[PDB]
Point group: C3
Amino acid sequence: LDLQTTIEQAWENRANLSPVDASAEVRDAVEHTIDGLDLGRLRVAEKIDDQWIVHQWIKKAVLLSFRLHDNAVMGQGPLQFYDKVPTKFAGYGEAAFKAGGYRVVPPAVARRGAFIARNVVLMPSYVNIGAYVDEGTMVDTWATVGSCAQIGKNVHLSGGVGIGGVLEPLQANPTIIEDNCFIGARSEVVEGVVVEENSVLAMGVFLSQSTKIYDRATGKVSYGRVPSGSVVVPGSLPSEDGSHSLACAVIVKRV
Amino acid sequence: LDLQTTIEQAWENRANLSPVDASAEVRDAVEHTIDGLDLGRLRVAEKIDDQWIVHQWIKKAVLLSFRLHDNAVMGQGPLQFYDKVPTKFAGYGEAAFKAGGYRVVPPAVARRGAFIARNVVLMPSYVNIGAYVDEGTMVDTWATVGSCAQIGKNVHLSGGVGIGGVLEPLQANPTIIEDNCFIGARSEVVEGVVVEENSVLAMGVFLSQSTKIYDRATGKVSYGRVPSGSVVVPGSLPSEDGSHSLACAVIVKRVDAQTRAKTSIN
Amino acid sequence: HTLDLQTTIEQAWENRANLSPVDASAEVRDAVEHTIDGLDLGRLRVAEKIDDQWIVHQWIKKAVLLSFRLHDNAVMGQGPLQFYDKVPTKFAGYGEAAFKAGGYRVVPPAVARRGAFIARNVVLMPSYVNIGAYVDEGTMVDTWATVGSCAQIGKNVHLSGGVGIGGVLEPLQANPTIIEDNCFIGARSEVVEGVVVEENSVLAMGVFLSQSTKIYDRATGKVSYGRVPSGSVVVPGSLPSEDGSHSLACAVIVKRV
Ligand SMILES: [Cl-]
Ligand SMILES: [Cl-]
Ligand SMILES: [Cl-]
Ligand SMILES: [Cl-]
Ligand SMILES: [Cl-]
């Protein structure tokens, strides 16, 4: 399709693109892709045939949007900033917010190019570009939804929860929290880990691709994915000689 | 008429209340209750006869204050918001701030209906509606004091500490941190856990009602309360077959003068 | 009438009982203000490494502490976000020219206090940097991270999301928390109380280090405190009690590159 081809050609030529040197065609393809992300009409990853697939060209558009803009002053006084990515809600009035159907509790901020669905509550928190936050999700205080992350419907991201961004590598799927999950306070899920639907993480669960996930029912370690309905708590596995343990995640039940 | 009685009847009638139809009697009682919370004249829970007591009617007022207001735009420039609870300080002038006796370090925010006592320092942090933060307490950077939480005097909530909110169920006591406690960085205390006076939590202690609290000196496991004078650190308990352990909280000792020196050094 | 900064500060420190916002000589106020200016610009720093040893400049900490005593709280804010504090924010009044000269990025709603140095090519995601901190070139401060007072962060450091680096102002003689060049500090980790993480080290998510934390070297079985040796990879773990009934969490060095 139109946008994708233009973005892919611009990507190959990115060494020659700058905020002062970019064609109308390139600028417009990037802007239209960011617009589509901001409205949820495009998404960095989606679930097709029961498998999450990533659209690398959309990540390329996001990265180009950084290359095509200089930093600019934003704000005033004790809240003065300098960045090249617009915030999502600058210039919104009552009509735009009423239309979006979500709440933005001060001092929450999202970047333009993140999609926030109806009935979401953003307590003070941060939602980065490319993220998709689906209907009914609660993002609690000092939580973070990182770049490109896909948050399902009726998810609860508790206080201080971090969902790690994945813009580069281009080939890598983003971090995914599927529908109805509860992610307990202080937990972190990063690096493209997939938490499948209906799962529960206790407080303080830290998952990357390298984290051992010990399944108490089977005695086996796995990585990168929490099966649907799993209850995951922090634990540890002992060394062979008994001198120490290393922390891991433990699946204690599956519902 | 009686403020509590007005609130209790409005609660029974809550299905028929909205931002466009509610009697003046009802709007005035809710607003007066939130005003009392904001000023510290009312509090959601209080300690009486050595026990924490919750005032359900004050929680009912907080919940009605959500039902009685629509979301509204607030904010300037790049920081634009949309919510139905006013921030605490939007209408404060220099005289109000001078009179309060506390400090609010940018970009800290509290909601209207939270009480902040004299000599408190709010580093960048969030204090939610119904919370009470008593005298001399330090709320450090990116900490959170959740809805209805009661924080005692001379408490140190370290960086990134979360005190969980409790509104529903109405009868449930809020999360309580009693006087002179130190709560180490990244710790979370939620769901009405009580940390009793003169206790110290190390970094990374996570307490809910289901967390095992293992007392090293007695080998006993308890839930829901840190006994006064306890030092609590992260640990774990082994499974019966030895294949793995599950993290828990461990009371390793009681607070001694060395503990006090280390939790006041900076 | 006007002396160098250090002498003026040390003199004023001895009189710190008699000093307030209303009574304070112009000489003392100017000296404090100029010391903070130097911190803000990176011309001065609370601690620096000399002869391969980190040393602290107590007089600079004295100036920071005096800056609190000499200033009243002041209103500041906009719209629903209203504050009241005695330490100015770093970027008040900055336009394009000041930010272009600094060479760093400040992503809303990140805030830093005046008296923190931010080097070129730093990215401050929403985060906080307190007075006296020094954040060196190319470092990434990720979302809801904190660089506490006087902390020294080296070049090309990655402070991941929710990382806290603890402040050390008092005691005067104590070295601040130090994260040396090229370190990666994983999400939710905390390094406080003057712990030193030496260059090229990697902390996994959820590593909490204070002076009281056991650092268990898996290769040797040895426990140490207060310092991560250069090149160490550190993860959360635990050590078992003598009777086997429980374990206590610690940091474990799993390898060293
Ligand atoms: Cl699934
Ligand atoms: Cl091992
Ligand atoms: Cl078990
Ligand atoms: Cl800080
Ligand atoms: Cl032990």
